[PDB]
Amino acid sequence: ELSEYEKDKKFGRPHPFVDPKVKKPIEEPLTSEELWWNWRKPDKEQWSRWQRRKPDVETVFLKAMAETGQVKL
Amino acid sequence: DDGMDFPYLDPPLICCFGAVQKEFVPSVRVSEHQMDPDIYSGWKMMQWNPPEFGRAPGGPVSNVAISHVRLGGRAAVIGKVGEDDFGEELVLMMNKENVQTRAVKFDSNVKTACSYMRVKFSDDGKMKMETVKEAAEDSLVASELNLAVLKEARIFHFNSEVLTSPSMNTTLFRAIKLSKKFGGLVFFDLNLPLPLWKSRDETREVIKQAWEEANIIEVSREELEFLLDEDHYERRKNYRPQYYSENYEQSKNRRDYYHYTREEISPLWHDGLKFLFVTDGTLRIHYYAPSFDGVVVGTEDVLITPFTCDRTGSGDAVVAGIMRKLTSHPEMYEDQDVLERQLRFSIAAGIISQWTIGAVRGFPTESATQNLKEQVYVPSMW
Amino acid sequence: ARIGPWGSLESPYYEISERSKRVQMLYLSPSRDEYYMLASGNSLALNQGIQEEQVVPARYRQE
């Protein structure tokens, strides 16, 4: 047959972009210590004006019909 | 009193006992700076630089109830009003904003906000006044207590003003006894009236009976240093080392946010207490619990709108937010992390309440309070 | 704006100091303007550290 997707890509039903059959995790990249000082994320979350997601219109509709079954987020 | 069929509604009710008044500022002291006796156009300069006791001035209990219900909660008010036009408009104002008025008693013997006194010239030429006939607000007797609000309400909130009149002392103590018999908490707000700012010992004698019955107590920074030691806590604040600082922060001469240790607030602590809150305006909130204590950090901004800034009523919003989050989340009592996270909503409400003229005109909404809390605080905190 | 002494244009600014003198507003002249750090930001920002290290735009010298 055609996978466990039923090849939702072939039909068009909602489905994750990546394949939920491999989804191999990361391989322990460099941690904060082994990074140069320019890429460090300085261990204390910094206040920024762009820290709250933009309200937007379509983010309301997507959440609206996700409850009614027309959308699978 | 046992009449009921279905369970109570979702938001627990709040009991607000006191006097119904419009734009009242109880806590009054001598401010060092004055800005012209006649021109009121420049008085707003005292809202950018408050006298350190009107930084977050609390008001009547009706203001607290209105701020609490506007934040998404439910509140009820116990009080008495006269059969006047002002008395009929105060209840209208409270009713217009979903404040339950089932426990407000109308009477015709006394007039609202009007009290009859008598001139009593003493030795020398210093006049005095003795209350001949009491005002309508402070004339509630224990017989006309609504034994339905007390049963339903889960938190009993009252302020110290009712301790300045004889009849309300007995009425308040009877209401406290009834509410405790029905299992409700007691929230004590210490917005001290002017006569109670006379001496520490007299005030401590006056408020001891009410203090020992409280489960939660909220006081300002000045109302605590006054109750423990004004001179010592004022000498400690203004102190800089003669040679060299101590850590580094002392070398920056920042503001003094002192977190009082549990051995200094011990004289004001008793077994029945569940929480002690000390608010330094909206800047910081020190919370003391039976097993832990800490400080929640906040900010303030009244120069963001220098022409429509009015600090009056912010303390009521802070207390109302505290009560709303206490009743909504019952796990804050024994969880310091949740306690700190839920105590920033009150700070956001207090910040918003200082951006408009009028105590009741501009109390913040729950959505606006959450918006400001999320916009000021880093995602890790909120 | 206001024409001050010696025919110099002056503008009002709120002085930030830990003394709370009485009137915290001053009328600054152009000669006294470029040697102070005039903020135009806000105090509505809180980080896990202390609030006094938050960053706001300012105007020092002519930058």
How would you concisely characterize the structure shown here?
Chain A has 73 residues and is an all-alpha fold. Chain A has helices at residues 8-11, 58-66.
Task: Determine the structural class of chain C based on helices, strands and strand pairing.
Answer: mainly beta
Q: What would you call the quaternary organization?
A: part of a larger assembly
Q: Any idea what the shape of chain A is?
A: flat
User: Total helix count of chain C?
Assistant: 1
What do these coordinates show?
The PDB classes it as transcription. The structure is cut from a larger assembly and holds chains A (73 residues), B (382 residues) and C (63 residues). By secondary structure, chain A is mainly alpha-helical. Chain A has helices at 8-11, 58-66. Chain B is 30% helix and 15% strand. The radius of gyration of chain B is 21 Å and the shape is globular. Helices cover 6% and strands 19% of the residues of chain C. With 63 residues, chain C is mainly β. Chain C has one helix spanning 30-33, and strands at 2-3, 9-14, 25-28. Chain C has a three-stranded antiparallel sheet. Chain C is elongated and about 50 Å long. Classes of the chains: A mainly alpha (73), B alpha/beta (382), C mainly beta (63).
Summarize this structure as a short list of keywords or feature phrases:
part of a larger assembly, 3 chains, A: 73 residues, mainly alpha, flat, B: 382 residues, alpha/beta, nine-stranded mixed sheet, two-stranded antiparallel sheet, transcription, plastid-encoded RNA polymerase, chloroplast, spinach, Protein PLASTID TRANSCRIPTIONALLY ACTIVE 12
Topology:
This is part of a larger assembly, with chains A (73 residues), B (382 residues) and C (63 residues).
Chain A: H1 8-11, H2 58-66
Chain B: E1 13-17, H1 45-48, H2 61-70, E2 74-82, H3 85-95, E3 104-107, E4 116-119, E5 129-133, H4 149-152, E6 155-159, H5 166-181, E7 185-189, H6 200-211, E8 216-220, H7 222-228, H8 230-237, E9 275-280, E10 284-288, E11 293-297, H9 314-328, H10 336-342, H11 344-352, H12 366-376
Parallel strand pairs in B: 1-2, 1-6, 2-3, 6-7, 7-8, 8-9
Antiparallel strand pairs in B: 4-5, 9-10, 10-11
Helix pairs in contact in B: 2-9, 9-11, 11-12
Chain C: E1 2-3, E2 9-14, E3 25-28, H1 30-33
Antiparallel strand pairs in C: 1-2, 2-3
PDB class: transcription
Keywords: plastid-encoded RNA polymerase, chloroplast, spinach, transcription
Entry title: Architecture of the spinach plastid-encoded RNA polymerase
